[PDB]
């Protein structure tokens, strides 16, 4: 019953300060504790540190130079800023929700424990890499049906070619349809830009003209684009 989503504006220049916040709509956050983790393709997951309602902080050995994270009480959520990012810090990051248990090898006073920190429910995640690139919006072209296999079924999709990161909405008719959906993640090019395609399977009796509209967004470019496809 506790939920997630993380907000990255995009990619900030080298030798600079990150900004990411991940809001939660579940309950009271001054009662528990939500950390960070990092996926990076071609390398393993890694966890980096945390802090408390009673403000007791911690960093990760390789990374403690300039990670600092302080969180707000009015807005129940966390706010992480770094300084001086390299190309390597390119990654999707999940705000990670840590539930603590005790353990103990015996009886408290003696000394008697490390505490483990295990992590319940986290977020879909928001994507941020890093390179010195600006912002531009995609290209929007329609690729009509074939007139595919025997009726019923046929095919049709939208093309989006030249856009800054792959992570872009592409809804159809504001999500009115989800049957037969398959949006392909894109292919990187020598020019340096993802190029995606996304297609739904239709029947030839379904034809034709019942207002299929392809709806794509992209925030760093702040572009809102729909495009009407037709044979």
């Amino acid at each position: 019953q506790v939920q997630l989503q993380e907000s990255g504006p995009g990619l900030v220049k080298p030798s600079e300060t990150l900004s990411l916040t991940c809001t939660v709509s579940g309950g009271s956050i001054s009662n528990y504790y939500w950390s960070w983790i990092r996926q990076s393709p071609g390398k393993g997951l890694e966890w980096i540190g945390y802090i408390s309602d009673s403000e007791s902080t911690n960093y990760n050995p390789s990374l403690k130079s300039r990670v600092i994270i302080s969180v707000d009480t009015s807005k129940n959520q966390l706010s992480l800023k770094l300084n001086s990012v390299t190309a390597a810090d390119s990654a999707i990051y999940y705000c990670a929700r840590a539930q603590q248990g005790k353990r103990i090898y015996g009886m408290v006073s003696f000394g008697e424990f490390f505490y483990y920190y295990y992590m319940d429910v986290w977020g879909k995640g928001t994507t941020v890499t890093v390179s010195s690139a600006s912002t531009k919006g995609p290209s929007v072209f329609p690729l009509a049906p074939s007139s595919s296999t025997s009726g019923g079924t046929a095919a049709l999709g939208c093309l989006v070619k030249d856009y800054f990161p792959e992570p872009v909405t592409v809804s159809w008719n504001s999500g009115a349809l989800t049957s037969g959906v398959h949006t392909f993640p894109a292919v990187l090019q020598s020019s340096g830009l993802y190029s995606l395609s996304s297609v739904v399977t239709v029947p030839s009796s379904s034809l034709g003209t019942q207002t299929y509209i392809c709806n794509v967004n992209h925030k760093p470019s702040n572009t809102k684009v729909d495009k009407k496809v037709e044979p």
Binding site: Y105, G106, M107, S109, F110, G111, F114
Partner: protein
Amino acid sequence: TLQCTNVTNNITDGELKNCSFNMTTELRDKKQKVYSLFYRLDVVQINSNKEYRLINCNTAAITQACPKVSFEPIPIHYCAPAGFAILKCKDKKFNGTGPCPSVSTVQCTHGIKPVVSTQLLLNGSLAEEEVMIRSENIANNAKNILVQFNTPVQINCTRPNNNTRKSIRIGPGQAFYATGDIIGDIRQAHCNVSKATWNETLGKVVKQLRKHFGNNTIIRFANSAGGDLEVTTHSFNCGGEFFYCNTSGLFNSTWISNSNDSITLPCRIKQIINMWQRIGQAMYAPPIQGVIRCVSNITGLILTRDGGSTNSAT
């Protein structure tokens, strides 16, 4: 000189050490470095990365006890010969000295087990009575006190580390018993007492001494406040390594005008001891491997007053 610093642990609780170090092999010019695990008290520093020296190296030699021999105490019956005879007294309320009205003839002691213990006695004889106990002369502080019970209460001293060991050969026939890797948790030496029985056996030790300082007078208690490391704390043997616990929880009460709640008492373990207050060749106690656990039967204690202050006030 055999360099080491602290043992692997999250920095919590001179727990122990782990030195790596020169040694002579069976062959003479041949040498070798190997490692072992000592305790804070066996070694003392001088100068680098860092490294200390063995506490006794200062003043005395050492011969390690053969682990083939064991120091579990057994009953000993001392015997007077023909041409003589021992004799026993046999009234329960007898105090330290005086003629005994009830007397019966023995020639050899009952089974006395020579327990090596400082400040307390246990697994000893127990009088059918209420624990009445004597000095050389109570009026003076300097001469000790020697309690012993009427119903014993249990004592189980513990350290739950499974030590490992390794025979290594110093030379022709000489094999030194190095302590090896610890496998499992890190755990300190301690000892349990349920106060429920302690404070009530205490309770009867409370009232009887009264018959010598008036039935209306203060009494007192806290921890030992004088002497060396070995006797200020409970020196004894359990299974092959010797203990030294501050008896802090115990000496904790004032009783004037007449759920398990088990005491737990931290101890440190020794290996090289100049016993019986005798300087000279020390003994190195070989370790003990695996768990340890020793039950026990408190029978008595030894005490000494502190002397000069206001009479009968406090």
